Amino acid sequence: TEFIRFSGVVNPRTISGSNSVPSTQVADARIEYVGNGYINEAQNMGWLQRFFLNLSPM
Amino acid sequence: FGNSRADMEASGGNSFNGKGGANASNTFSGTLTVTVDQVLANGNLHVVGEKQIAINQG
Secondary structure: OEEEEEEOOOOHHHOOOOOOOOHHHOOOOEEEEEEOOHHHHOOOOOHHHHHHHHHOOO | OHHHOOOOOOOOOOOOOOOOOOOOOOOOOOOOOOEEEEEOOOOOEEEEOOOEEEEOOO
8 A cells, every 4th residue: 555645835826727736836845655565564674784774883 | 537536427306296176066956935934124035945755765
C-alpha cells in the first residue's frame, strides 16, 4: 500500500480555469510519498548497519 | 703560471619556483512560495518560507 499525502495553503487567484493549481504556488507545501508491506521493509537498513553508519570511526 | 698554479674552474646555480591558487562556486535552481511575516517602515516585505518533502525514505 502506497500513500501520497499533501498539505498546504493556496491563494484563490492562482487557481486556473480548470480548477487546478501547480504545486509550486502552494505556500506551506508538505508532500509525502510513502508505502508499507515487505517491499518497503526491504529498503530500511539493518539495525546493526544503521548503528555502524553512525558510530563507526570512519 | 707554471705547474697549473693559476688554472681555475668554478660553477654555481640557484633556482626557485612558487605558485598557488584557489576557487569556489555554487549554484541553485528551483521555485518556492513564501509568506509575508512583517511589513517594514518603508514598504519592504520580510518573507519566510519552508517546503518539506518526504520521498519514500527520508
